[PDB]
């Protein structure tokens, strides 16, 4: 029976048509996977050699295509171009990182473990792993889930969201050039696709995406082997003693990809003595910050009004906002402003909700062992900042932060080496760094009698 | 409180009278180990493994009390037992000593004018959850890289076998301190509600059905699981001389009620009929009630006749039941050799978790690996084989966290052991145990 379910998507910037997709339904998430698998025998065979000089190819090919995965990533995002050309940069690098990464592991040592016997552990791949990435970092997303999961040896089923299938068919495209048919396969649909996909015979899923979400493919997912990453609700500790350009850094952290990202700084907390210093000069910084110029739009209509939702239920008696200024013709996107909300309870629906937009809130506490109270108040758990000139102070309260980033004197900084994954209800997921690659593949012990 | 009247699975006796925890009961033991989880979390590692070393050598100090423990609702002869109380300790002292030597992502300028560096930090309060087949070592398993790793934790022992998993409890409290490691008796109920109490991560060994229900309850604890095997022994005509005897001998240690136990004997057909001979004479050689214990309890005994019953075998080969005067009321159960039957035989699919083996024959070593490698459950294999080139390519190729080559059974605490498929993705044993309990922190300063 004839049958294609359509989406037609809109640019955020605008509102208009930008282009026409089918979705894929079971049949095309069942053939996607049986590809994945066929691929898989000769792709694991490769020796590490070969794999990472495939590998390498893969990200030389998108940095040599750049130009059009940019435009391909904004597209569905609205990201400004230097933020989605750092992106391409970003991307490429990781593919490399984890290219040599792959070539230089450890395992337990062999040798005479047990009388008698010769004993070795080898690391092998899980087989086909579903990777299912949010419209917030569509490209980068991708890159932090495939770039381990094709390093280890597996083949990918890869599921982008709905309004951004752009750069992920890139990607399945320039893969078949450099790693081969099949080992990576893109799957364009909306949520019920990816239900289709933990369903469907892949070894492990790796999500990342809202906790609601998450909640749910835990269930799904029966016995294959899950990787989590869910939202964050960052805290940033302002100490008295903040260097100058604190208010500067945290609010372009907080406008960067218009505030839509899991680890950007939300809840301020300072002292009692630098709680009116921190709202006005956040208020100052932010306002020079003007949404459509600045930064660009939030990715669709239903974050905009989520945003609006928030704002409206907030008891905040502080309330600062910066302007608003769509270019011309742009006025059917999804824009909204930077604000800074202060004055407000512990509970407010500000800080305990994941705004996922730039959108600062401003709490004082009494001494540093209560902003760490507030700080580590939250059930999510991702990232978190210090700001402050004090060695043993700021040091101390970033090895008691509860995340599995803390930066101190800056925020939302990373790099390929350096892993970042949360506690608490953020998902237990290791994104970067060689601690990513275990997650993909399994140790096997040889032991042989002699 | 309900209270568990548990029997000797040696008599069908009544032998102890426990408390079996309910809600209250599980709330407060998961409030103890919080309690105590930031003075543990403080110790330093030098601190934190002369705790553990303590522990270690207070239970091999107290190691004929374990025994007699161990062997109260299990049955196990005098000499596992006390090869397993030796096992547990030095799995503690092999994770005192792989705390301090941990690693991470090497520090320094990753980002321009940025120093960075890596800590690891632990989960908070786990949740054990083990089964009756090695009461001991199974919490050793468990409790040894969590607690290493900083976390406290609640340990649910089986309702058949909890007598150990208390003097855990009371030992670590003299050695790591009050409400380190707190231990919860009870049935499945209880471990359903300490899945869905206030802590931070589960780790559970048992049986598929209930890592099913584990994963859907668990929500976004951190979650390992540990699930059944159904172990192949791919056996070529070069084998050397022992090998029925040792098949056999690992197949009613414990009596077969071990998750890497042999259980799928895949030969040539040059091989068969010498491989169902030889393993049935060895097999006759051990007496159910002599040479290996009873099955843990009645449910067992039950499930063993179930499949055996429907299994379609041609060839059954039944070894001597001789329970002791005495002991006619245990759940005794033989040891069988079953041969000639089809690929999907339930004796094949099915975990039998008793010490019988299946004999099944292939063309060649491709067909005997697409045997071994056919089950949804891929944890531990053997090859039996004198080529070097042979056996070792069938090692690389075998789904399996353990391949053993000219032997079976044989574990060590640096060496790691886990599953694929539908065994669950856990690993327990070697250094790399000590992730599953632990967080990486970036730290990033800005210079
Ligand atoms: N922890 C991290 O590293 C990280 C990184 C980026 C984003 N995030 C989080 O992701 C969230 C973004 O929200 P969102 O609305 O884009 O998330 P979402 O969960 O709605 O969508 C994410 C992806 O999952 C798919 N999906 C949704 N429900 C599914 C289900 N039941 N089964 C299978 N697939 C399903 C969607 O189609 C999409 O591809 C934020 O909470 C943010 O913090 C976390
Ligand atoms: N390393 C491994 O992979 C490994 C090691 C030993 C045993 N096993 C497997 O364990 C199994 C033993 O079977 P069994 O019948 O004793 O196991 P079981 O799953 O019935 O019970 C195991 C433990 O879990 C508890 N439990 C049971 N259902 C639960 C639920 N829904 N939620 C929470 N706790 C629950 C029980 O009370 C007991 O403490 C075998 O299949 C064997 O292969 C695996």
Request: charged residues 20%; glycine residues 10%.
């Amino acid at each position: 029976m004839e049958d294609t379910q359509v989406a037609v998507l809109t640019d955020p910037r605008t509102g208009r048509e930008r282009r026409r997709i089918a979705l894929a339904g079971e049949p095309e998430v069942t053939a996607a996977v049986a590809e994945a698998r066929g691929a898989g025998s000769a792709w694991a065979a490769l020796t590490p050699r070969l794999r990472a000089r495939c590998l390498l190819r893969f990200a030389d090919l998108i940095e040599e295509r750049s130009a059009q995965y940019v435009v391909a990533e904004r597209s569905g995002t609205g990201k400004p171009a230097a933020e989605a050309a750092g992106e391409v940069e970003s991307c490429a690098d990781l593919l490399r990182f984890y290219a040599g990464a792959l070539r230089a592991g450890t395992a337990p040592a062999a040798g005479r473990l047990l009388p008698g016997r010769e004993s070795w552990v080898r690391w092998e791949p899980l087989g086909v792993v579903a990777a299912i990435v949010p419209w917030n970092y569509p490209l980068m997303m991708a890159a932090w889930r495939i770039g381990p999961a094709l390093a280890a040896g597996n083949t990918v089923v890869l599921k982008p969201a709905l309004t951004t299938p752009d750069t992920a068919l890139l990607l399945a495209r320039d893969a078949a050039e450099t790693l081969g048919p099949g080992v990576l396969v893109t799957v364009p649909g909306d949520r019920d696709t990816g239900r289709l996909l933990v369903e469907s015979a892949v070894d492990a899923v790796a999500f990342t995406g809202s906790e609601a979400a998450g909640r749910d493919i835990v269930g799904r997912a029966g016995l294959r082997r899950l990787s989590l990453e869910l939202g964050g609700n960052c805290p940033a500790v302002v100490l008295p003693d903040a260097p100058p350009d604190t208010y500067e850094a945290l609010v372009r952290a907080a406008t960067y990809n218009a505030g839509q990202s899991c680890a950007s700084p939300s809840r301020v907390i300072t002292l009692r003595e630098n709680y009116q210093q921190a709202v006005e000069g956040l208020a100052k910084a932010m306002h020079a910050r003007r949404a459509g110029v600045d930064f660009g739009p939030l990715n669709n209509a239903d974050q905009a009004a989520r945003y609006d939702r928030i704002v409206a239920r907030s008891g905040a008696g502080i309330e600062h906002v910066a302007p608003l200024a769509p270019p011309p013709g742009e006025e059917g996107g999804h824009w909204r402003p930077g604000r800074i909300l202060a004055d407000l309870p512990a509970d407010d629906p500000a800080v305990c909700e994941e705004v996922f937009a730039p959108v600062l809130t401003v709490q004082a506490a009494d001494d540093p062992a209560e902003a760490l109270a507030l700080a580590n108040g939250m059930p999510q758990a991702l990232a978190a900042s210090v700001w402050g000139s004090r060695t043993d102070a700021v040091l101390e309260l970033a090895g008691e932060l509860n995340a599995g980033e803390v930066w101190v004197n800056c925020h939302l900084e990373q790099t390929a080496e350096l892993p970042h994954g949360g506690r608490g209800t953020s998902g237990h997921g290791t994104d970067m760094s060689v601690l990513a690659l275990t997650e993909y593949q399994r140790p096997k012990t040889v032991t042989v009698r002699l």
